[PDB]
Amino acid sequence: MTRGERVIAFIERFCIVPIGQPMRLDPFQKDFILAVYDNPAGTDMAILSIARKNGKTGLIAGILLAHLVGPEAVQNTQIVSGALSREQAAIVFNLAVKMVNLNPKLQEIVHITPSGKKLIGLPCNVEYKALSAEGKTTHGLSPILAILDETGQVRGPQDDFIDAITTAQGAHENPLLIVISTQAANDADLLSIWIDDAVKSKDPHIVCHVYEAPKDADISKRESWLAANPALGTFRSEKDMARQAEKAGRMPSFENTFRNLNLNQRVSTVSPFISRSVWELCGEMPINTPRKWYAGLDLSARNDLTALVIAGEADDGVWDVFPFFWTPQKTLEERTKTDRAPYDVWVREGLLRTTPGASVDYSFVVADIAEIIGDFDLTSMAFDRWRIDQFRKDADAIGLSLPLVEFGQGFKDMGPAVDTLESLMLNGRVRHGMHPVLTMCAVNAVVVKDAAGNRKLDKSKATGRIDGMVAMTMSVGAA
Ligand SMILES: [Br-]
Ligand SMILES: [Br-]
Ligand SMILES: [Br-]
Ligand SMILES: [Br-]
Ligand SMILES: [Br-]
Ligand SMILES: [Br-]
Ligand SMILES: [Br-]
Ligand SMILES: [Br-]
Ligand SMILES: [Br-]
Ligand SMILES: [Br-]
Ligand SMILES: [Br-]
Ligand SMILES: [Br-]
Ligand SMILES: [Br-]
Ligand SMILES: [Br-]
Ligand SMILES: [Br-]
Ligand SMILES: [Br-]
Ligand SMILES: [Br-]
């Protein structure tokens, strides 16, 4: 009998639905459990993505209890569930408590703490805590198992709460992270990045079962509903799906909610930024003649590739673009191989610049910029709105005054700048001199478009670096 088959057996033997009947897992739930636990390579992370109301809470509770007192229970450990809100943490906790108190065989080996959200599986001394990003940071945190609940609600590419849990698991040799969530609405959101990385890499240590209706599928058809709702008829009401599908049809402002929540689709779109052929048509060398010069600086990727772009409109219609790049010296040989880009050759050829260490040293970047801006009277320099004072202080510290203007890295501020840049490329109004590094960034660039029509470049969607294009977008955007 397999490890996964034991979890299933445990859930179906000891877990009772709250009403009355013993829990019977659907094939999609079983197949997910089998894939996680009977992975011969070992599973580090497991993602199951399904539409709303397909039995998430029950499955989370079942798996927790298998680890609390069932066949996965191991001595003196902690297990956690993590959600964004108190409410969500209570829902999972309350369902687990009800399961514990509906079966005397579970009831008789679990102690519940009279404050907080904490269960102890007594036989193996397993502590279970229900956590949320809302409310107090708990002191003792070191989970061998963490189930993240509805992580698709995270809007950034990062979240402090998720990272705290992730970091805490790092104390153990081979911990398990399980994510059960409806997809994020946007391709740039944390869960979308996790799913995409798993799907593109086919990493043997990652399981990723995603149930979604295809993009072009008819929202009123049952086969579209089944594709996103694998529990259609058992846990998920088909009557309710039919009502929500009709509402989506009659209310266009509800369609995106229906698509995300009930068809498990992302509502954003993704495409390449530019073809090499179109890019190459703007590759005549740039000139430096007096004008309003605008700068865009992207230092964000401190371990990979930093970029400054100075650009400005000539007396003809055309924009001349001068890019400068910084990269860490220690990790140059490693990254050349990792990224499959000739960074070594470019540094040697004076087209890429280094900073000592594994990180990009701000001190060395501002020193070069001072030499660079000797040839440019800048009107503005666009920079991350959240890190502008820290860079302004470090620039001022070396005697270098820069006309810094705040520039958002999200969809609202990038949207118009991407549209402007695209429009200039399309009518041949750029001279970039086929700079190899910028060209690499252009060709790697992917653009995510949100539901409101705002476009931005995505470093996670792209294979290889794109940081020159972010700086070029900001540079254009600053006018
Ligand atoms: Br089975
Ligand atoms: Br819902
Ligand atoms: Br749900
Ligand atoms: Br066992
Ligand atoms: Br355990
Ligand atoms: Br509840
Ligand atoms: Br909580
Ligand atoms: Br916490
Ligand atoms: Br939820
Ligand atoms: Br990959
Ligand atoms: Br339902
Ligand atoms: Br798409
Ligand atoms: Br200046
Ligand atoms: Br200045
Ligand atoms: Br923004
Ligand atoms: Br334009
Ligand atoms: Br969106």
Numbering used by the authors: 1 to 18, 23 to 483
The publication says:
A large number of double-stranded DNA viruses, including tailed bacteriophages and herpes viruses, use a homomeric ring ATPase to processively translocate viral genomic DNA into procapsids during assembly. By contrast, pac systems feature imprecise, sequence-independent cleavage of the DNA concatemer during head filling, giving rise to variable genome lengths inside virus particles. Both systems encode a large terminase (TerL) protein, composed of a viral packaging ATPase domain and a nuclease domain, and a small terminase (TerS) protein, which recognises the cos or pac site between genome copies and, upon binding of DNA, recruits TerL to make an initiating DNA cut. Crystal structures of the large terminase and DNA-recruiting small terminase, a first for a biochemically defined cos system, reveal mechanistic similarities between cos and pac systems.
To gain structural insights into the active ATPase of the HK97 system, we determined the crystal structure of the apo HK97 TerL at 2.2 Å resolution. The structure comprises both ATPase and nuclease domains, with the two connected by a short linker and a unique β-strand (red) that is absent in pac TerL proteins. Unlike in lambda gpA, a lysine residue, K60, occurs at the expected position; however, like in lambda, a second lysine residue, K57, occurs N-terminal to the classical position. The Walker B motif resides at the end of strand β6 with catalytic residues D153 and E154. The HK97 TerL nuclease domain has an RNase H-like fold, with residues D302, D388 and D471 at the catalytic center. Residue K463, which follows the hairpin, protrudes into the active site, forming potential salt bridges with D302 and D471 and coordinating a water molecule.
